[PDB]
Design a protein around this ligand. Structure first.
Ligand code: CLA
Ligand code: CLA
Ligand code: CLA
Ligand code: CLA
Ligand code: CLA
Ligand code: CLA
Ligand code: CLA
Ligand code: CLA
Ligand code: CLA
Ligand SMILES: CC1=C(C/C=C(\C)CCC[C@H](C)CCC[C@H](C)CCCC(C)C)C(=O)c2ccccc2C1=O
Ligand code: SF4
Lengths: 220, 742, 141, 42, 65, 157
C-alpha cells in the first residue's frame, strides 16, 4: 500500500509539475498564442477564435495546478494520517491489508474515522467535536461553492445582474437607492480565482476538521 | 381534408453514404482537417434542422428516427422478457414473492465476477434485478417462461417491424409535409386509437387474463397447476366460477345493467391486503374508463368531415380576461417547428414521468411491488431522473426554437412577444423567489446546524423546537383520509393510505405504505424542493428568454443556440448562450432530483419501509430518524449518507460488490468531469501541441490534427461525466443499501 | 461628409418592453438609430420583442452601441435599408457615429487615417522587459 | 460488398471489431488460465 | 334492450333528441340526400353523443331512483 | 389593460395594473419615501417609526431568549441595535453618494411632464436630515412598541 500511494504521490507531483512547467514555458507564447507575453500573466482568454482559448494564460495553468496540488497534498496527508492513526491505534495490519484498494481508503479511513467527527452534534446532544463537525460541513459548503465559480462561468451572471439592475431601478422605494459602482458580474480570471479560493478554503477546512476530530476523538 | 400525401423513393438505399462520413452537411462532408471534425460529426448527427432547411425532409427524418427508437425499445423489451424467460427465477419468485429476490440476470464465471450471482433465492444464483418486471408479469398473469419467451420473440418481431417501417417511411415511401402538418388527425388517432384503444385492450387483457390468474395466485395456487388464460376465454364455466358476472355475458353491457359487472370492475379504493399492490379489479375498471374517456376525447378535432374542432379555430378564438387576444399564430409555430413541439412534449412527458414516480411509490399498482423496496426505490429514483432530464430537454428545445425557428415577420404570436418583452421582470422575480427560497429553506437547515452545534436544540426548526408544520399538506392528508366516506362514497377505502387511518397493508414481514407523516422536516425539505425547482426554472427559462437578445449581446440569435461565448469583452460572455443555460440547468436538475430521491429514500426507510412484528408494532429500516436528523445537514451527512452507505462498503464479497465498485468508479467519473468543467480548451490545446511535437519527433504525427475539445464540448463532456458519476454513485448507493436491508 | 442632423422623426409601433433606457441615459450617454424603411413591416428589435417600423423615416433610441449596430446589420442584411445611428449625451451634443464618412466602414474610403496601426508583424513586438517601468506597453513600441 | 467494406473500415466499426475480438481473446485466455499473477513458463 | 323499458325509453329519446338537435337545432362533402346537411358523419356524431347522454341518464337513474 | 411606460415604449418598464393603478399611484406617492415636497426629516421620522415599530417583533418573539423573561426587554434592545446599524448604513450611503453641496440628482419632472421641483431627499444635507429622522423615529418606534408589548395585552403573534 505504501508503494501504491507513493506512486500516487509521484503522479501528483509530476502532474502539478507538468501543469506549472507547461504554464511557465508557455508563458511567453505557444503556437496557439505566440503573443501571450504581450497580454501579461493573468488574462482571461484569447477569445473563441482559433478553436477556443479558454484558460490559456500561465495564470490559468497555475490555477489548474492548485487543484492538482491540493489533490497531491490530500493524497500525501491521507497516507500520513491513516498510516499514523493505524500505528497509534495499534493495528498496522489494518493499513497494510486495506491501503492497497481504494474502498479500503473510503471505508476504513474516511467512513470509519469520521464517525466521532460527524457525531460532534447529534439530535440528542453534542460533544467537544461539535466545532469540527460544523467546520467539516462548512468546508464542504465552500468547497462546493467554488464549483459555482469554476463550473458556472460569466455571461450567465452578467445577464442575470442586468435583470436585477432593471428590478432595482423599477422597484418602488428602491429607486431612491442607487449604486455608485455599476454592479457587473465577476470577471473571468477573477472568478477562477474566487472559485479556487472557495475550493481551497473548503479543502483545507474540511480536512483540518476531519484530521483533528478523528485524531482527537480517540487520540490513538 | 387530410390526404395520405406520400412520395415514392425520395432517398436511394445504398451504402455510398455509409462510406463517406459526415455526408449530411456542408462543413462535415469534406473530411477531417482536425479531430474536432469527429466531435462536430456526432454533435450535429441528429441536428436535422441544420442538415436540410425544409420541414418535409426534417419530418421524414424524425419520423423514421422515431421508428428506429421504437425498434430499439422493442428490442430492449424483447431482451427483458427473454432474460426473464431463460435467465431468471420468475417461477421461484411467483411461488414465494416475499423472500425470493427478483433476479433476471446471470453473469458468466470468467474473472471471479461469478460472485455477483448472489443467493437471491429459489435455487437460482444471479443478480437481483430492480426493474419490477416480475411484478408486471404477475400483474399480467404470466406464470410461465414459455409466455415470456414467445413475447420476447414477438418483441423481436416488432423491432424488425419498426426497423422495416423506418426504412419504408424514409427510403421507399415517405410522407410529405401535408401529412405531418395536419395534427387534428394525429391527435384524434393518438387519443382514440393509441391511448383510447390501448387502454381498452389492456383492460380487455386484465378482465380476461390478469384478474382471474391473479385471483388464483392470491387464493394460493402453484403457478404450474394454474389454468392458462385461453382456458379462461374459452371455458366459460371457469371464468364464470371466478366471476359469475361473466355468466350473463355482454347483455349486462349492452342493456346497461353494469351494476352486475361490479364483481370484476370494482371501485374498491386502496391497496390489495393480500399482495400489497392495487386492486386489479380497480385497475381494469380504470383502464376501461380511461378508454371511454380518451375515445370520446379523440373525436374532438376536425380532420376530414364537418364535425370537430380546429386547433387554429380554438386558439384564434380564445379571448379571455388575461391576454386572450393572443394565442393567434401558435398553430403556425407548432405545425412549422419540430423544436417547439419537442420542447412542449418533453416538458409534459418528463412531468408525467415524475407524476408516474410519485403515483407508483404511493399507489403501488403491481402485486408485491411495495415490499420489494429495491423495486420501489429504483422506480421512483429512475422516473424522477428521467422526468428531470426530459424537462431540461424541454428547456434545450425551447431555446432551439427561440434561436432558429422564430420569425416575428412571418410567424408572429402575441403571447410569446409579450413574454419576451417583460422577460426581465420574469427573470428578476424568479431570481428573487429563488434567493428567498434558498434562504428560507437551506438557511433554516444552517440555523438548525448552528443551533444543534451550539447546544441549542430548543432553537432549531423541528417538532421538538420552533415548529414549521405543513398545515396545508396535513390538511390535505386529513381530507383524503376522510374523502371516501363523504365526498367519494363509491370508494370503500381512500385512493391511497399515505393520508391516514388504521390501515397498514403488510403482506409478510414488510410494511408496504403506512400513512406517511408530515412534520417540520418535511416542510423544510419540500421547500428545498420548491427551491431547487425554481432555480432550475430560473436557469432554463432564462436561457430560453435570452436565447435571442439581451442587454449584453443583442445579436445572440446570429451567434447561434450552441456557441461558447462572444469573447472576454463586456467583462466576459463565457456562458451567455442558451446551450450554456441548459448545461447549468442540468447541474441544478441534478441537485434537485438528488435531494428529491434522498428525501424519498430516507422518508420511506424511516417512516414507511420496515418490518412488522407478531405483536403489531413496526420497526423501520433507519428507525424514524427523519424528523430529528433530516432537519440538519449534519444528519443528512451522518444518519443518511454515512449511515446508509455502510452496505455499499460492506458490499465487497456478497453479490453487491459491483454496487460497491460502481460506487467508487461513479465517485471517480464525477470527479473526472471536474477536469472539464473547471478547465478550458487553451491549456489542453497547448499541452496537445507539446505532445504533437513529441509525436513529430518520431514520424508518428497524425493527419487528423489533434485539437483540444471545443469549449462547448468541454462543457458537454463535463456535465455529462458529472451527471453520470453523481447519478451512478447514487444508484450504487441506493441499490446496495436497499438490496442489503430490504 | 457632413453628418445627417438627427431630426424629431417618428418611432416604430412598439408596445413597450423591459429592455429600454434605465439609468445609462439619465446620467450617461444613450444612443439613437434612424433608418428609412420603404414599407411598414415587422422586425425583431434588439431589446427583446418585435416592433413594427413605419414607412419612411423611423427613429429608435437604444441603450448602447451594440444594440444599434446589431439592429443596423440585421436591417442592412435582411431589409437592405441604409441605417445610421448617433450618440446623444444627457446634455445634448448628438454625436454622429456609425458610417463617419457616409460610406460603410467595410469600404476603404480615402481621408480616414491610420490610427491603431503597427508597421510590424505581430511577433516582432518587444518583450515586457523592454517596456518595464514605462507607461507604454509591448504593442505601442 | 462495395462501400460496406469502407464503412467497416471506419474507425469506430473497426475499433469495435478489433476490441471485440481482442476482448474475447483475453476473456477466453482468462477462462483457460484464470487467476494469473506470475509468468511461470519462462 | 328489452324494448319498452325505462333503459330503452330514456336512451331512445336521448339518441333521437340529439339527432334532432343536430338536424333542426343548435348542434351541428359526404353528399347525402338529406335536405339540409346532416351527413353520415354528423348522424354518427349525434348518435354517439345521444348514446353518451343515454348511458349517463340510465346509470344516474340506476344509481338512485 | 397593460400600457407602455408613459406612452414611451423604449424605456425599460411598462404601465401595468400593478405599477400604474390609481390606487397604487395614490398609495406609493403619499408615503414618506415619495413625499418629495416636504423636507426629508419628517418623512424620515415616519420611515424610522414604521421600521422600528415592527422590527421589535422578530427580535422579541423569535430571538435567542424569546422564551425567557427578557423576551421583549432584549428584543427591543436588539431592534434598537438594528436601527443604530441602519442609521449608520444610511449615513455612509449619503456620504458616499452626495458629497457636500451638489444639486439634487432626483428625477426633475413628473410623469405628465410638468417641471416639478427636484426632490431634496437626494441631496447631501437632505439625506443627512433623512438619516437623523430615521434614527430618531426608529428608536422612538422601538421604545413605543416595547411600551406596548408589556402595557397592552395581546394574544401576541
Ligand atoms: C440497412 C439498410 C439501410 C441502408 C443501406 C440505409 C442507407 C441510408 N440511410 Mg437509412 N434507415 C434505415 C436503413 C437503411 N438506411 C432504417 C432501418 C432506418 C430507420 C431508423 C433508416 C432511417 C434513416 C434516416 C432517418 C436517414 C437515413 C439516411 C440514410 C443515408 C445515410 C446513412 C448514414 O450515413 O448513416 C449511417 C448510420 C448508421 C449506420 C448508424 C446506425 C444507427 C442505428 C439506427 C441505431 C443504433 C443505436 C444503438 C443501438 C445505440 C448505441 C449503442 C452504442 C453506444 C454501443 C443512406 C442512403 C439519411 C439520409 O439519406 O438523409 C440525408 C437520413 O436522414 N436513414
Ligand atoms: C389510430 C392510429 C394510430 C396509432 C395507433 C398511432 C400510434 C403511434 N404513432 Mg401515430 N399517426 C397516426 C395514427 C396513429 N398513430 C396518424 C393518422 C398520423 C398522421 C397524422 C400519425 C402520425 C404520427 C407521427 C408523425 C409519429 C407517430 C408516432 C406514433 C407512435 C408513438 C410512439 C408510441 O406511443 O409507442 C407506442 C407503441 C406502439 C403502440 C407499438 C406500435 C405497433 C403498431 C403495429 C403500430 C400502430 C399502428 C400504426 C398506425 C400502423 C397502422 C398499420 C400500417 C401497416 C399502415 C405510436 C405507435 C411517432 C413515432 O413513434 O414514430 C414512429 C411519430 O413520430 N404518428
Ligand atoms: C425526445 C427526446 C429528445 C430528442 C428527440 C432530442 C433531439 C435533439 N437534441 Mg435534445 N435533449 C433531450 C432530449 C431530446 N433531444 C434531453 C432530455 C436533454 C437534456 C440533457 C437534451 C439536451 C439537448 C442539448 C443541450 C442539445 C440537444 C440537441 C439536440 C439535437 C441534436 C442531438 C445530437 O445530434 O446528438 C446526437 C447524440 C449524441 C451526441 C449522443 C449524446 C451522448 C449522451 C449525452 C451520453 C449519455 C449516454 C449514457 C446515458 C451514458 C453512459 C454511456 C456508456 C457508453 C459509458 C436533436 C434535435 C442539440 C441541439 O439541437 O443543438 C443545436 C444540443 O445542443 N439536446
Ligand atoms: C453549496 C454550493 C452552492 C451554493 C451555496 C450556491 C448558492 C447560490 N447559487 Mg449556485 N451553483 C453551484 C453551487 C452553489 N451555489 C454550483 C456547483 C453550480 C454549478 C452549475 C451553480 C450554479 C448556479 C446557477 C446557474 C444559479 C445559482 C444560483 C444560486 C443562488 C440561489 C440561492 C440563493 O441565493 O439563496 C440564498 C443563498 C443561499 C441559499 C446560499 C447559501 C447561504 C446560506 C443560506 C446562509 C447565509 C448566511 C448569512 C448570509 C451570513 C453570512 C456570514 C456573514 C459573516 C456575512 C445562490 C447564490 C442561482 C442564482 O444566483 O440566482 C438566484 C442561479 O441562477 N447557482
Ligand atoms: C495497469 C494495471 C494493471 C495490471 C498490471 C493488471 C494485471 C493483471 N490483472 Mg488486472 N485489472 C486492471 C488493471 C491491471 N491489471 C483494471 C484496471 C481492471 C478493471 C478493468 C482489472 C481487472 C482484472 C480482473 C477482473 C482480473 C485481472 C487479472 C489480471 C492478471 C492478468 C492475467 C491474464 O489474463 O493475462 C494473461 C496474458 C494475456 C491475456 C496476454 C496474452 C497476449 C497474447 C496471447 C500475445 C502473447 C504472445 C505473443 C505472440 C508473443 C510470444 C513470443 C514469441 C513466440 C513471438 C494480471 C496480474 C486477472 C487475474 O488473473 O487476476 C490476477 C483477473 O481475473 N485484472
Ligand atoms: C338528467 C339526468 C341525470 C341524473 C338524474 C343524474 C344523476 C347522477 N349522475 Mg349522471 N349524467 C347525466 C344526467 C344525469 N345524471 C348526463 C346527461 C351526463 C353526461 C353524459 C351524466 C354523466 C355522469 C357521470 C360521468 C357521472 C354521473 C354521476 C351521477 C350521480 C352523482 C353525481 C355526483 O357528482 O354526485 C347521480 C346519481 C356520477 C356517479 O357517481 O354515478 C354513479 C358520475 O360519475 N353522471
Ligand atoms: C423586512 C422588510 C421590510 C418591511 C416589512 C418594510 C415595511 C414597510 N416599509 Mg420599508 N424598506 C425596506 C424593508 C422593509 N420595509 C428596505 C430593505 C428598504 C430599502 C429600499 C426600505 C425602504 C422604505 C422606504 C423609503 C419607505 C418604506 C416604507 C415602508 C412601509 C410601507 C410601504 C410598503 O411596505 O409597501 C410597498 C412595497 C413595495 C413597493 C415592494 C414591492 C412589492 C411588490 C409590489 C410585491 C407584489 C405585490 C403583488 C400585487 C401581489 C412599510 C411599513 C415607507 C414608509 O415608511 O411608510 C410609512 C417608505 O416611505 N420602506
Ligand atoms: C418575524 C415576523 C414578525 C413577528 C414575530 C412579529 C411579532 C409581533 N408584531 Mg409585528 N410585524 C411584522 C413581522 C413580525 N411581527 C411585519 C413584517 C409587519 C409589517 C411591517 C409587522 C407589523 C406589526 C404591527 C403594525 C404591529 C405588530 C405587532 C407585533 C406583536 C403582536 C402581533 C408581536 C411582538 C403589534 C405590536 O404592538 O407590537 C408590540 C403591532 O401593533 N407588528
Ligand atoms: C434564512 C433562514 C433562517 C431563518 C428563518 C432564521 C431564523 C432565526 N434565526 Mg437563524 N440562522 C440562519 C438562517 C435562518 N435563521 C443562518 C443561515 C445562520 C448562520 C449563518 C443562522 C444563525 C443563527 C444564530 C446564531 C441565531 C439565529 C437566531 C434566529 C432567530 C432570530 C432572528 C432574529 O434576530 O430576528 C430578526 C429578524 C428579522 C429582522 C426579520 C424581519 C423579516 C420580516 C418579517 C420580513 C417581512 C416581509 C414582508 C412579508 C414583506 C411584504 C409586506 C410589505 C409590503 C409590508 C430566528 C428564529 C437566533 C436564535 O437562536 O433564536 C432562536 C440566534 O441566536 N440564527
Ligand atoms: C481533459 C480536457 C481536454 C483534453 C481532452 C481530449 C483532447 C479529449 C479526449 C480524446 C480521447 C482520449 C482521444 C483518443 C480516442 C481515439 C478514438 C483513439 C482510439 C484509439 C485507442 C486510444 C483505443 C480538453 O480538450 C478540454 C477542453 C475544454 C475544456 C476542458 C477540457 C479538458 O478537461
Ligand atoms: S468562454 Fe470565456 S474564457 Fe472561454 S473564450 Fe469565451 S470569453 Fe474567453
Amino acid at each position: 500500500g505504501d508503494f501504491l500511494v507513493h506512486h500516487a504521490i509521484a503522479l501528483g507531483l509530476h502532474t502539478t509539475t507538468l501543469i506549472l512547467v507547461k504554464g511557465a514555458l508557455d508563458a511567453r507564447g505557444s503556437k496557439l498564442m505566440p503573443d501571450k507575453k504581450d497580454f501579461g500573466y493573468s488574462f482571461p482568454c484569447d477569445g473563441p477564435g482559433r478553436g477556443g482559448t479558454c484558460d490559456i494564460s500561465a495564470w490559468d495553468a497555475f490555477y489548474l495546478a492548485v487543484f492538482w496540488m491540493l489533490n497531491t497534498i490530500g493524497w500525501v496527508t491521507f497516507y500520513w494520517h491513516w498510516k499514523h492513526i493505524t500505528l497509534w491505534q495499534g493495528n498496522v495490519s489494518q493499513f497494510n491489508e486495506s491501503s492497497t484498494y481504494l474502498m479500503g481508503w473510503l471505508r476504513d479511513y474516511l467512513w470509519l474515522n469520521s464517525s466521532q467527527l460527524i457525531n460532534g452534534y447529534n439530535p440528542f446532544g453534542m460533544n467537544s467535536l461539535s466545532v469540527w463537525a460544523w467546520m467539516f460541513l462548512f468546508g464542504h459548503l465552500v468547497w462546493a461553492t467554488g464549483f459555482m465559480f469554476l463550473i458556472s462561468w460569466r455571461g450567465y451572471w452578467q445577464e442575470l445582474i442586468e435583470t436585477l439592475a432593471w428590478a432595482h431601478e423599477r422597484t418602488p422605494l428602491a429607486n431612491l437607492i442607487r449604486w455608485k459602482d455599476k454592479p457587473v458580474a465577476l470577471s473571468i480570471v477573477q472568478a477562477r480565482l474566487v472559485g479556487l479560493a472557495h475550493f481551497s478554503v473548503g479543502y483545507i477546512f474540511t480536512y483540518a476538521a476531519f484530521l483533528i476530530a478523528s485524531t482527537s476523538g480517540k487520540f490513538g | 381534408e387530410v390526404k395520405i400525401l406520400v412520395d415514392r423513393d425520395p432517398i436511394k438505399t445504398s451504402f455510398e453514404e455509409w462510406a463517406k462520413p459526415g455526408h449530411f452537411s456542408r462543413t462535415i462532408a469534406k473530411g477531417p482537417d482536425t479531430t474536432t471534425w469527429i466531435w462536430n460529426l456526432h454533435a450535429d448527427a441528429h441536428d436535422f434542422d441544420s442538415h436540410t432547411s425544409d420541414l418535409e425532409e426534417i419530418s421524414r427524418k424524425v419520423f423514421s428516427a422515431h421508428f428506429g427508437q421504437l425498434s430499439i425499445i422493442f428490442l430492449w423489451l424483447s431482451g427483458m422478457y427473454f432474460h426473464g424467460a431463460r435467465f431468471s427465477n420468475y417461477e421461484a419468485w411467483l411461488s414465494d414473492p416475499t423472500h425470493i429476490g427478483p433476479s433476471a440476470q446471470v453473469v458468466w464465471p470468467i474473472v471471479g465476477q461469478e460472485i455477483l450471482n448472489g443467493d437471491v433465492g429459489g435455487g437460482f444464483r444471479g443478480i437481483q434485478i430492480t426493474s419490477g418486471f416480475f411484478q408486471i408479469w404477475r400483474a399480467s398473469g404470466i406464470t410461465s417462461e414459455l409466455q415470456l419467451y414467445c413475447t420476447a420473440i414477438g418483441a423481436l418481431v416488432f423491432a424488425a417491424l419498426m426497423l422495416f417501417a423506418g426504412w419504408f417511411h424514409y427510403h421507399k415511401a415517405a410522407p410529405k409535409l401535408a401529412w405531418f402538418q395536419d395534427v387534428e388527425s394525429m391527435l384524434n388517432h393518438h387519443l382514440a386509437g393509441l391511448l383510447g384503444l390501448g387502454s381498452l385492450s389492456w383492460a380487455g387483457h386484465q378482465v380476461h387474463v390478469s384478474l382471474p390468474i391473479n385471483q388464483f395466485l392470491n387464493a394460493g395456487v402453484d403457478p404450474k397447476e394454474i389454468p392458462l388464460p385461453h382456458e379462461f376465454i374459452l371455458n366459460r364455466d371457469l371464468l364464470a366460477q371466478l366471476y359469475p358476472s361473466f355468466a350473463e355475458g355482454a347483455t349486462p353491457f349492452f342493456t346497461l345493467n353494469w351494476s352486475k359487472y361490479s364483481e370484476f370492475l370494482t371501485f374498491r379504493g386502496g391497496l390489495d391486503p393480500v399482495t400489497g399492490g392495487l386492486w386489479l379489479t380497480d385497475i381494469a375498471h380504470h383502464h376501461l374508463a380511461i378508454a371511454i374517456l380518451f375515445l370520446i376525447a379523440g373525436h374532438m378535432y376536425r380532420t376530414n368531415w364537418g364535425i370537430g374542432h380546429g386547433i387554429k379555430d380554438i386558439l384564434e378564438a380564445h379571448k379571455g380576461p388575461f391576454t386572450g387576444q393572443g394565442h393567434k399564430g401558435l398553430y403556425e409555430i407548432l405545425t412549422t417547428s419540430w423544436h417547439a413541439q419537442l420542447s412542449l412534449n418533453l416538458a409534459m412527458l418528463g412531468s408525467l414521468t415524475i407524476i408516474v414516480a410519485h403515483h407508483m411509490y404511493s399507489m403501488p399498482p403491481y402485486p408485491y411491488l411495495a415490499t420489494d423496496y429495491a423495486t420501489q426505490l429504483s422506480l421512483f429514483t429512475h422516473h424522477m431522473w428521467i422526468g428531470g432530464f426530459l424537462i431540461v430537454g424541454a428547456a434545450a428545445h425551447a431555446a432551439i426554437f427561440m434561436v432558429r425557428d422564430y420569425d416575428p415577420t412571418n410567424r408572429y404570436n402575441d403571447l410569446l412577444d409579450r413574454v419576451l418583452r417583460h422577460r426581465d421582470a420574469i427573470i428578476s422575480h424568479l431570481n428573487w423567489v429563488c434567493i428567498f427560497l434558498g434562504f428560507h429553506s437551506f438557511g433554516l437547515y444552517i440555523h438548525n446546524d448552528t443551533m444543534s452545534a451550539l447546544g441549542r436544540p430548543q432553537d432549531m426548526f423541528s417538532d421538538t423546537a420552533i415548529q414549521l408544520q405543513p398545515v396545508f399538506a396535513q390538511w390535505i392528508q386529513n381530507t383524503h383520509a376522510l374523502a371516501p366516506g363523504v365526498t367519494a362514497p363509491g370508494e370503500t377505502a381512500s385512493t391511497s393510505l399515505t393520508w391516514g387511518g388504521g390501515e397498514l397493508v403488510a403482506v409478510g414481514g414488510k410494511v408496504a405504505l403506512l400513512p406517511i407523516p408530515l412534520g417540520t422536516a418535511d416542510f423544510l425539505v419540500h421547500h428545498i424542493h420548491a427551491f431547487t425547482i425554481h432555480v432550475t426554472v430560473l436557469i432554463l427559462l432564462k436561457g430560453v428568454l435570452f436565447a435571442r437578445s439581451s442587454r449584453l449581446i443583442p445579436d445572440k440569435a446570429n451567434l447561434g443556440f450552441r456557441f461558447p461565448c462572444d469573447g472576454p469583452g463586456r467583462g466576459g460572455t463565457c456562458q451567455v448562450s442558451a446551450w450554456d443555460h441548459v448545461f447549468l440547468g442540468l447541474f441544478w436538475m441534478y441537485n434537485a432530483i438528488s435531494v428529491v430521491i434522498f428525501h424519498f429514500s430516507w422518508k420511506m426507510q424511516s417512516d414507511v419501509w420496515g418490518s412488522i412484528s407478531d405483536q403489531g408494532v413496526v420497526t423501520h429500516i433507519t428507525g424514524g430518524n427523519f424528523a430529528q436528523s433530516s432537519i440538519t445537514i449534519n444528519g443528512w451527512l451522518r444518519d443518511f449518507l454515512w449511515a446508509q452507505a455502510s452496505q455499499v462498503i460492506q458490499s465487497y464479497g456478497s453479490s453487491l460488490s459491483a454496487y460497491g465498485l460502481f460506487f467508487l468508479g461513479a465517485h471517480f467519473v464525477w470527479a473526472f468531469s471536474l477536469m472539464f468543467l473547471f478547465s478550458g480548451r487553451g491549456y489542453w490545446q497547448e499541452l496537445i501541441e507539446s505532445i504533437v511535437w513529441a509525436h513529430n519527433k518520431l514520424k508518428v504525427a497524425p493527419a487528423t490534427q489533434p485539437r483540444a475539445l471545443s469549449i462547448i464540448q468541454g462543457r458537454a463532456v463535463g456535465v455529462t461525466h458529472y451527471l453520470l458519476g453523481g447519478i451512478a454513485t447514487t444508484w450504487a448507493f441506493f441499490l446496495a443499501r436497499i438490496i442489503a436491508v430490504g | 461628409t457632413p453628418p445627417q442632423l438627427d431630426p424629431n422623426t417618428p418611432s416604430p409601433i412598439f408596445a413597450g418592453s423591459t429592455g429600454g433606457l434605465l439609468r445609462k441615459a439619465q446620467v450617461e450617454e444613450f444612443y439613437v438609430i434612424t433608418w428609412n424603411s420603404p414599407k411598414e413591416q415587422i422586425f425583431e428589435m434588439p431589446t427583446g420583442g418585435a416592433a413594427i417600423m413605419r414607412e419612411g423615416p423611423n427613429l429608435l433610441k437604444l441603450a448602447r452601441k451594440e444594440q444599434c449596430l446589431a439592429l443596423g446589420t440585421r436591417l442592412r442584411s435582411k431589409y437592405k435599408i441604409t441605417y445610421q445611428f448617433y450618440r446623444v449625451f444627457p446634455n445634448g451634443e448628438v454625436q454622429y457615429l456609425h458610417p463617419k464618412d457616409g460610406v460603410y466602414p467595410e469600404k476603404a474610403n480615402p481621408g480616414r487615417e491610420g490610427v491603431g496601426l503597427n508597421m510590424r508583424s505581430i511577433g516582432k513586438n518587444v518583450s515586457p522587459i523592454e517596456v518595464k517601468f514605462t507607461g507604454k506597453q509591448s504593442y505601442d513600441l | 460488398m462495395r462501400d460496406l467494406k469502407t464503412y467497416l473500415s471506419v474507425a469506430p466499426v473497426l475499433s469495435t471489431l478489433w476490441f471485440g475480438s481482442l476482448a474475447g481473446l483475453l476473456i477466453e485466455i482468462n477462462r483457460l488460465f484464470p487467476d494469473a499473477l506470475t509468468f511461470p513458463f519462462f | 334492450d328489452f324494448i319498452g323499458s325505462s333503459t330503452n325509453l330514456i336512451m331512445v329519446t336521448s339518441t333521437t333528441l340529439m339527432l334532432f338537435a343536430g338536424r333542426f337545432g343548435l348542434a351541428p362533402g359526404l353528399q347525402t340526400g338529406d335536405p339540409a346537411g346532416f351527413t353520415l358523419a354528423d348522424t354518427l356524431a349525434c348518435g354517439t353523443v345521444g348514446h353518451i347522454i343515454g348511458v349517463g341518464v340510465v346509470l344516474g337513474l340506476k344509481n338512485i331512483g | 389593460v397593460v400600457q407602455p411606460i408613459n406612452g414611451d415604449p423604449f424605456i425599460g418598464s411598462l404601465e401595468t395594473p400593478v405599477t400604474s393603478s390609481p390606487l397604487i399611484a395614490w398609495y406609493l406617492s403619499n408615503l414618506p419615501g415619495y413625499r418629495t415636497a416636504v423636507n426629508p426629516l419628517l418623512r424620515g421620522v415616519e420611515v424610522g417609526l414604521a421600521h422600528g415599530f415592527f422590527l421589535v417583533g422578530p427580535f422579541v418573539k423569535a430571538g435567542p431568549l424569546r422564551n425567557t423573561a427578557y423576551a421583549g426587554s432584549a428584543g427591543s434592545l436588539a431592534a434598537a441595535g438594528l436601527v443604530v446599524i441602519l442609521s449608520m448604513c444610511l449615513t455612509i450611503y449619503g456620504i458616499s453618494s452626495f458629497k457636500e453641496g451638489e444639486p439634487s440628482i432626483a428625477p426633475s419632472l413628473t410623469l405628465t411632464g410638468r417641471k416639478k421641483q427636484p426632490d431634496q431627499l437626494q441631496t447631501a444635507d437632505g439625506w443627512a436630515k433623512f438619516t437623523g429622522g430615521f434614527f430618531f423615529g426608529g428608536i422612538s418606534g422601538v421604545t413605543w412598541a416595547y411600551f406596548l408589548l408589556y402595557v397592552l395585552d395581546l394574544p401576541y403573534f
